Enzyme design. Structure first.
Site, PDB file in Angstrom:
ATOM      1  CB  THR A   1      -0.940   0.038   1.225  1.00 20.38           C
ATOM      2  OG1 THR A   1      -1.790  -1.112   1.205  1.00 20.38           O
ATOM      3  CG2 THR A   1      -1.802   1.307   1.242  1.00 20.38           C
TER       4      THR A   1
ATOM      5  CB  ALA B   1      -8.410  -5.010   3.723  1.00 23.26           C
TER       6      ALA B   1
END
Ligand SMILES: [Mg+2]
Ligand SMILES: [Mg+2]
Ligand SMILES: [Mg+2]
Ligand SMILES: [Mg+2]
EC number: 3.4.25.1
Lengths: 204, 125, 212, 222, 233, 195, 222, 196, 195, 196
Positions: C1, C49
């Protein structure tokens, strides 16, 4: 600290009609960090082609080792080594280091100059030979490559068609693996000509 | 625990305990609030039957809830301390979570909510 | 990410990638890592997530309850603190979150808060969060100025994610752009790295390390 | 020491069309190197035109599906028989999964159906409840084998228009129910060849505005 | 967190045209010690269901008491307890499956593998498995422990899929079960010669057979086997 | 030992190496030169495990100098890099491996070209336009991807390098006490005294 | 892997499956597991694949040299003794588990060898992940005084049990029959009951689909 | 494993079961655990099958070489060679061996060699996992100078009980009789011994 | 969170706290104020575990502010320090303790004296003329033992403090990005903007 | 420990050794392992002495309270109470208990409760560390409906062998006879039983 997945990378080889293909990505990284996008994993000794995935230092070392051995072979035998013979040499050399192995996934590809038969082979890190008619896969996206090859592959493909199949198998496998990609090379090998093509792919 | 419903409806639709609490307020000393153009003033009566008092230490009728809000009252003096304490705690809790002092409306809404809760809770007047 | 958000003359730029990974397996390339809390509030997601997605949508519900009760839009500080106080209660339980709460209000102006799962809460002008945060910082810091135009600012945020997407193995897919002004947030599209890279390479003359 | 989790193998596959959606899954159930059943369904009709599968640890999978089916039933009671939309079901499942954040359901969940505009929808979940709407998703043991094939064939990734110098991409378009089923069958036969936990049978649930239809196909049993 | 102490080995079972067969040996092992020799591991519930249990025997006895209590509870305020509202195999299984999964979820499992064999009220064969993890599955043949590895292969040669069930008689099915029990006695170190067998038929009902023995065993060839390689004498 | 950088430009190779030597909670030195001249037109910077770094660098230096005397000839940067790689490749499977990462910056006099090689302690060799070891790369690579051009001058390469050091000095946790910069070109090896 | 060995009237037969795994992934769908030590002495291997091949080739090389030295045909007990002493020396670190079978002037022989160096004798044996499924068949149907055709049937039936019921085994059946007085007959792919069904679609791409950056002719000649 | 050796009037008898296990799986149900190291010197093996086979093979080699030079070895000599191997390599071995042999001078003799590599000469010996269950039975029922038939019944009844209680033991009961007459192999099947 | 220092001079208490906030291999911020005003004449600096530091500091702040309103009276530095100590003393035997170390600098208006208290996360309280937490003390204490005098002015205390920061900037491994200095005296709390 | 309970014609007899060890040290050489939970319901304890004493005391309490309300409890009932304690608290207990009792209706009965907390009704039972060595002897020598004298000899000979081979067992042999006649305590000293 898993030697086979530090540097990343993939190799795939396929057979066609009177031809073989071998392909690889260009990535070399240090885990998450991408370091090089020019690191080719396919080498050749005469007409026999060798792809090697896994720990990059061992990739380089084994290339230098097989260049060493095939050069001496040629001088003594007075002929270029054949794919069947080279496959046995790779196996012998890997198993010689049974309890201190090179952390690699080699793939042999080539056409026998005498019989004209297309040949491919794969190995585990300690030299167990995986012979196959259809295809051989190796590297950090081997699962992805097995899936792509199993569905996309069909027998007796022409060189031009085989190129498309092997290229699409590699690209889409690489895009589902973090440690693979960053460019790709495909060798199309015919009886007495060899074409090398660099593929355009996503650079992430 | 003591559960008895002390505040309840009567046939005419009144809650006598709440209305009798208003009578306690009517008994209390007078308090006045007047707001101007740029200020507010709080006036408070103090009954003069009590001489010999110590005005230094005797609880003041107007209480600071925060540095910017004040609270005066009429009625039971002991009851007022419980509301003032709860109000002061809420003022600091508001600064802690919202990173901003309470609005006057918010503080009023909290105090009023506490008072309401004591009109339909068991075992309390 | 890789996520970033920076403050500048014309407000706030927010930029993120869209890759999701489970080990070395690329699970998804089309993940939404920006949460739209309200017309004036954004939240970025890095780390786990589920933790990010669940608790930041929960945060939106709490921000909505605030404006119902108080008849006024919640401050960026107050919004960020609800989240930081929430995760702090769970400290030690194993939540993994690297978030940035971005927004504009009258009293605060354009404001960015960094909030993570070990309880840290920081106000700041520039932040990059995630596995590719260092790569984004390198491009962002060297080209950042307060007097940037809205056009150049949007591009820098986009270019910073691209840089990280390229080098970081666990970042990629596409770039999602957002601009936050006095009037609220404005979406500036989804940009696939597959096409964006070659476009930037050609037009900018950068990325000479790559075989063109 | 007691290990509360297990791996029951198998693989699942969800694809969304224009006015339809499919959710497919193999019927093989395994533990270690043994076959428990050659036909044990794990793709279920949950009502309201929603199909669901929770692949991985079958006990957790059955528990989750059972709980979601029950959630649909109570949604009807509490909200005047209102139809549970696919997006509302997806959010509901997130809370079911995240409710056990610190002792997770060890499953990859996929649901399929039609959105409120009548268009095909597939939603995929991780074990702890993060979700996303997608045109395409494979889950389970052979996900790594099937998924890149789908990227190439469904979403046309890495395919450029011939003769355009790799400049113009192959255009995206909706696939027919016939073409989708072909890709599903070819995906599962390929997975059956190269994955030991995949085989025996293939059960596909197709969702259209008319309802939920089933199709069964044999797979290799070795 | 548990560990099994006194244990029972394989439970094997299969479907046939009119019903189901289930079998399990009468041994209660204590590690490598073959401690107890009169242990019944097939427990009938009513006249239409047989629950076969392997694993921890103390937990098996707990499950016996639960089933025994379930029959009592079902009979309360139930005029049709021996008719329309009698306990079905499917009811009995789901109850156990609920319990097994609840216990694993509290990290305190019943250390068992269970097969519920029976015939439903409409004549349908019922055969389903549940274990300590709460995992459940159904198949024309089911087996636990070593039975899964050695019995299933033999039983699947008779009934390889659903369509083979009507073609399989009770005589053929029982023979395959008895043959499987002999194979397990040859090759499972925690098995005994003595076993019980239960047949639940939709016509003839529940037939429970006790004190069966493995017989017609091949041992004669052992006399010719000498040494471990080179030894001739 | 922490920060070592390398940039290959048009006509030279520039190596930048941090001056700090830290042991425990004390910076023992702030002027350490983490490099050895292997030959007149070849320079090697190094970083890694304490003791091993210098011991390895000096061992390589001695071997290359021995070769120079024996043949009265300077080995090419490619030849030196291969020799170094092999030594590290031997080392990794030894009883106690050299935990040393190196950059080799050299100017090939026959080709009239600068060359930069990055080699880690495993014996992993790569030729690059710019390189780094350790955490340095996580900041510099993305910066160089953006600003680097292949036809840059030495002065432009130094300005590019300044930009890297500034970014490291801003975002790196540890104080590495600046860098010593050295240039390798056709005329040999020289040090930039004011950086 | 499933491997078996069965003695009969005038000889011995061995058999094996043809699946090669790589975890849960099938690497080779038709590998040859039956190896030659000498012309009439064959070997079936399970466990670590490189070790079974390497050890069978090494002993096979030394057996050939021994046969030349002694002017005699190699004996199975010699291969057995040479294998077990080699394996014992490495204390199980060479993960070779073998079934050895053959004929020699002394008669017909059948042994099993384990990685640590222990050996066994038998009339019927099974090794590998599918050994229990295979042994179940062997214990059901084996009898004394089998004929050649009965033994081949029993052996291939035992391998089939592993193919169908063991996930580690699959694809085809290889057989080798060693009868006294005759040459050994290697029956590669004696059974092929797992043929891949025709795919629903052809995935041959249009030429030009793949984007290319550079082309070049590679020089393989001198 | 259940193994024993018993001296009697005419010589010595070795007895053993035939079960070999890998965990709870029976790898071989007809194992021959009675192994010849010389004409009339045999041994019962327990523990690691790889270790005990390796040892027995080396001993057989030593006694063959001994016989070529010095003539027939004593049972004590055979036991000494076993011990030497078991004792010196005790860190890398798991072997519990009972040595039994017949001389014409010394008649029947029994030596047991446990894990550590110590040697113990005895009238009879029991070993293996199943022996634990018959220490009581054997101690109460063993007599010196028994007849052949009595010794066979003693071993049969003893191993029958060991097999009955030990899951690691089972199959057939093999026996080897060592006397002046020669070497006799005996076998007893489950249907006989189980119902004793 | 790393460097917090305290110096009590004649008529004031000076607290110096580092500006760096580092997470992993990234300095996320270089202007962090690691302190909270508990009351007009009492200041608390803090350092330790991420999250806990600010959460604890603000919790204490709220409690002292609550006391101030309730009594319309400022608690003495000694009283505040004892309250803080007790909270940390409770914390250390909790399920999850506050891993936070603090310095409390205050001016007692009744005594007309500055006061500096050092309290660690265990609840260990000491009143000192100068104090520090973490590795800072290993350099500063010996320096202050030498140069410190009890009758020093505020300006002299700042020059003494500069000498400490210079030594830390020289010998400390990590870059702590300078310090924010605050003075606590009879007139209240003020910040030195140029340091 | 070596403990056993044996049913016979007139009722049931419990038997036990008297050794308690802390490692290799004998903490008590005259322990009484035969414990009364009711008039004619006794138990033999093995495993953790703290656990088995705690359990037996709780059972004795339950059976005393049972008797006050419902009259004399059955031996099966006593075994059920033991089981309930051993089974529900299996994670925190190390108790191997043999329950033995005499009813007038049911005569002599024996129940054994191993570590896990399962219950097993048997004609006779053996338990404790020393029981392993007499599985063979007891199985061969036990007969149903033995006389009192025969059952005493059986237990005496059995425990004598258990004591002989088990270092954790020894001392005196205690026995408790449960019949319609009443409760009789017996004791046998080393000088008698050792030379059997
Ligand atoms: Mg990739
Ligand atoms: Mg990337
Ligand atoms: Mg398959
Ligand atoms: Mg047995």
């Amino acid at each position: 600290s898993d030697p086979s997945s530090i540097n990343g990378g993939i190799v795939v080889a396929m057979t066609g009609k009177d031809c073989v293909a071998i392909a690889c990505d260009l990535r070399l990284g240090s885990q998450s960090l991408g370091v090089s996008n020019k690191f080719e994993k396919i080498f050749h000794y005469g007409h026999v082609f060798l792809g090697i995935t896994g720990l990059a230092t061992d990739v380089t070392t084994l290339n230098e080792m097989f260049r060493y051995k095939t050069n001496l072979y040629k001088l003594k035998e007075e002929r270029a080594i054949e794919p069947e013979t080279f496959t046995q040499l790779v196996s012998s050399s890997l198993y010689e280091r049974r309890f201190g192995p090179y952390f690699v996934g080699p793939v042999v590809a080539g056409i026998n100059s005498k019989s004209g038969k297309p040949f491919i082979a794969g190995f585990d890190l300690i030299g167990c030979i995986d012979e196959a008619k259809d295809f051989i896969v190796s590297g950090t996206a081997s699962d992805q490559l097995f899936g792509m090859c199993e569905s996309l592959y069909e027998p007796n493909l022409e060189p031009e068609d085989l190129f498309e199949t092997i290229s699409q198998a590699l690209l889409n496998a690489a895009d589902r693996d973090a440690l693979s990609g960053w460019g790709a090379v495909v060798y199309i090998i015919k009886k007495d000509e060899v074409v090398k093509r660099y593929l355009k792919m996503r650079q992430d | 625990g003591y559960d008895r419903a002390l505040s309840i409806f009567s046939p005419d639709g009144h809650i006598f305990q709440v209305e009798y609490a208003l009578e306690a307020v009517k008994r209390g000393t007078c308090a006045v609030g007047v707001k101007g153009k740029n200020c507010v003033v709080l006036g408070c009566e103090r009954r003069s039957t009590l001489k010999l008092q110590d005005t230094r230490i005797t609880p003041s009728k107007v209480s600071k809830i925060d540095s910017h809000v004040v609270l005066s009252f009429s009625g039971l003096n002991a009851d007022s301390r419980i509301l003032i304490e709860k109000a002061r705690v809420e003022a600091q809790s508001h600064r802690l979570t919202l990173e901003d002092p309470v609005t006057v409306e918010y503080l009023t809404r909290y105090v009023a909510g506490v008072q309401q809760r004591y009109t339909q809770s068991g075992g309390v007047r | 990410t890789t996520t970033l958000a920076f403050r500048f003359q014309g407000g706030i730029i927010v930029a993120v990638d869209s890759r999701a990974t489970a080990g070395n397996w690329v699970a998804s390339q089309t993940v939404k890592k920006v949460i739209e809390i309200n017309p004036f509030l954004l939240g970025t997601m890095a780390g786990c997530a589920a933790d990010c997605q669940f608790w930041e949508t929960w945060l939106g519900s709490q921000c909505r309850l605030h404006e119902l009760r108080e008849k006024e839009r919640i401050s960026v500080a107050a919004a960020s603190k609800i989240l930081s106080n929430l995760v702090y209660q769970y400290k030690g339980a194993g939540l993994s979150m690297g978030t940035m709460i971005c927004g504009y209000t009258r009293k605060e102006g354009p404001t960015i808060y960094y909030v993570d799962s070990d309880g840290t809460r920081l106000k700041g002008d520039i932040f990059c969060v995630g596995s590719g945060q260092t790569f984004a910082y390198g491009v962002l810091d060297s080209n950042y100025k307060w007097d940037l135009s809205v056009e150049d600012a949007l591009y820098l945020g986009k270019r910073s994610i691209l840089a990280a997407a390229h080098r970081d193995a666990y970042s990629g897919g596409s770039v999602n752009l957002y601009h936050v002004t006095e009037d609220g947030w404005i979406y500036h599209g989804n940009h696939d790295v597959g096409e964006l890279f070659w476009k930037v390479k050609e037009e900018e003359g950068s990325f000479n390390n790559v075989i063109g | 020491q007691f290990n509360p989790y297990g791996d029951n193998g198998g693989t699942i596959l969800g694809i969304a069309g224009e006015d339809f959606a499919v959710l497919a899954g193999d019927t093989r159930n395994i533990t270690d190197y043994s076959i428990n059943s050659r036909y044990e369904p794990k793709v279920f009709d949950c009502g309201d035109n929603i199909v669901m599968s929770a692949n991985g640890f079958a006990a957790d999978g059955d528990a989750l599906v059972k709980r979601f089916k029950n959630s649909v039933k109570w949604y009807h009671f509490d909200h005047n028989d209102k139809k549970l939309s696919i997006n509302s079901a997806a959010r509901n499942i997130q809370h079911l999964l995240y409710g056990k954040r610190f002792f997770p359901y060890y499953v990859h969940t996929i649901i399929a159906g039609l959105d409120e505009d009548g268009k095909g929808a597939v939603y995929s979940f991780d074990p702890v409840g993060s979700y996303e709407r997608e045109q395409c998703r494979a889950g389970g043991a052979a996900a790594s084998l099937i998924m890149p094939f789908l990227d190439n064939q469904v979403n046309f990734k890495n395919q450029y228009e011939p003769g355009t110098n790799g400049k113009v991409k192959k255009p995206l378009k909706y696939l027919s129910v016939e073409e989708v089923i072909k890709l599903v069958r070819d995906s599962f036969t390929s997975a059956t060849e190269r994955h030991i936990q995949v085989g025996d049978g293939l059960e596909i649930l197709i969702v259209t505005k008319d309802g939920v239809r089933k199709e069964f196909y044999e797979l290799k049993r070795d | 967190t548990q560990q099994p102490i006194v244990t029972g080995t394989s439970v094997i079972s299969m479907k046939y045209d009119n019903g189901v067969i289930i079998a399990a040996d009468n041994l209660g092992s204590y590690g490598s010690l073959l401690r107890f020799n009169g242990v019944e591991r097939l427990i009938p519930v009513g006249d239409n269901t047989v629950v076969g249990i392997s694993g921890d025997i103390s937990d098996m006895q707990h499950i016996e008491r639960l089933l025994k209590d379930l029959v009592t509870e079902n009979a309360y305020d139930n005029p049709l307890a021996d008719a329309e509202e009698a306990l079905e195999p499917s009811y009995i299984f789901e109850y156990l499956a609920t319990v097994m999964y609840q216990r694993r979820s509290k990290m305190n499992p019943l250390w068992n593998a269970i097969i519920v064999a029976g015939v439903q009220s409409n004549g349908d064969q019922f055969l389903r498995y549940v274990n300590l993890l709460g995992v459940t599955y159904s198949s024309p043949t089911l087996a636990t422990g070593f039975g899964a590895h050695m019995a299933n292969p033999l039983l699947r040669k008779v009934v390889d899929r659903e369509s083979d069930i009507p073609k399989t008689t009770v005589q053929v099915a029982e023979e395959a079960i008895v043959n499987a029990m002999r194979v397990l006695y040859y090759r499972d170190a925690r098995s005994s010669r003595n076993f019980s067998l239960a047949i639940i038929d939709k016509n003839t009902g529940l037939t429970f057979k006790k004190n069966l023995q493995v017989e017609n065993m091949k041992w004669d060839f052992a006399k010719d086997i000498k040494g471990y390689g080179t030894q001739k004498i | 030992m922490d920060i070592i950088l390398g940039i290959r430009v048009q006509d030279s190779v520039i190596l930048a190496s941090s001056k700090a030597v830290t042991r425990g909670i004390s910076v023992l030195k702030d002027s350490d030169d983490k490099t050895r001249q292997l030959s007149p037109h070849t320079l090697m910077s190094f970083a890694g495990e304490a003791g091993d770094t210098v011991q390895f660098a000096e061992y390589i230096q001695a071997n290359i100098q021995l070769y120079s005397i024996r043949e009265d000839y300077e080995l090419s940067p490619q030849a030196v890099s291969s020799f170094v790689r092999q030594e590290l490749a031997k080392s990794i499977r030894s009883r106690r491996p050299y935990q040393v990462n190196v950059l080799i910056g050299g100017y090939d006099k026959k080709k009239n070209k600068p060359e930069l090689y990055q080699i880690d302690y495993l014996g992993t060799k790569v030729e690059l336009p710019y390189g780094a070891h350790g955490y340095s790369g996580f900041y510099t690579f993305s910066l160089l991807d953006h600003h680097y051009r292949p036809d840059m001058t030495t002065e432009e390469g130094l300005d590019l390098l300044k930009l890297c050091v500034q970014e490291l000095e801003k975002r790196m946790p540890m104080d590495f006490k600046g860098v010593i910069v050295k240039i390798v070109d056709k005329d040999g090896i020289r040090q930039v005294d004011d950086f | 892997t499933t491997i078996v060995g069965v003695k009969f009237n005038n000889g011995v037969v061995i058999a094996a499956d043809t699946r090669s795994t790589q975890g849960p992934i099938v690497a080779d769908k038709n590998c040859a597991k039956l190896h030659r030590i000498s012309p009439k002495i064959w070997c079936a291997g399970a466990g670590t694949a490189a070790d079974t091949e390497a050890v069978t080739q090494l002993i096979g090389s030394n057996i050939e040299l021994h046969s030349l030295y002694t002017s005699r045909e190699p004996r199975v007990v010699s291969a057995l003794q040479m294998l077990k002493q080699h394996l014992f020396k490495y204390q199980g670190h060479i993960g070779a588990y073998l079934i050895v079978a053959g004929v020699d002037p002394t008669g017909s022989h059948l042994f099993s060898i384990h990685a640590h160096g222990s050996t066994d004798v038998g009339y019927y044996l099974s090794l590998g992940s599918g050994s229990l499924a295979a042994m179940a068949v062997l214990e059901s149907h084996w009898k004394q005084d089998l004929t050649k055709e009965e033994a081949i049937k029993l052996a291939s039936d035992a391998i089939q049990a592993g193919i169908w019921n063991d996930l580690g085994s699959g694809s085809n059946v290889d057989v080798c029959v060693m009868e006294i007085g005759k040459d050994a007959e290697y029956l590669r792919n004696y059974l092929t009951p797992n043929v891949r069904e025709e795919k629903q679609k052809s995935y041959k791409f249009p030429r030009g689909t793949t984007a290319v950056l550079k082309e070049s002719i590679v020089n393989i000649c001198d | 494993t259940s193994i024993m050796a018993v001296t009697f009037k005419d010589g010595v008898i070795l007895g053993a079961d035939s079960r070999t296990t890998t965990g709870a799986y029976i790898a071989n149900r007809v194992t021959d655990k009675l192994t010849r190291v010389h004409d009339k010197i045999w041994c019962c093996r327990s523990g690691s099958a790889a270790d005990t086979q390796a040892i027995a093979d080396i001993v057989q080699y030593h006694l063959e070489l001994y016989t070529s030079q010095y003539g027939t070895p004593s049972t004590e000599t055979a036991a000494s060679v076993f011990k030497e191997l078991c004792y010196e390599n005790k860190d890398n071995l798991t072997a519990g061996i009972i040595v039994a042999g017949y001389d014409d001078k010394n008649k029947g003799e029994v030596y047991t060699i446990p894990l550590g590599g110590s040697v113990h000469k005895l009238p009879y010996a029991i070993a293996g996992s199943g022996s634990t269950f018959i220490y009581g039975y054997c101690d109460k029922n063993f007599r010196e100078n028994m007849s052949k038939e009595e010794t066979v019944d003693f071993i049969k009844h003893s191993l029958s009980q060991a097999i009955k209680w030990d899951g690691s033991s089972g199959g057939v009961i093999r026996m080897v009789v060592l006397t002046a007459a020669g070497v006799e192999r005996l076998i007893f099947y489950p249907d006989e011994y189980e119902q004793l």
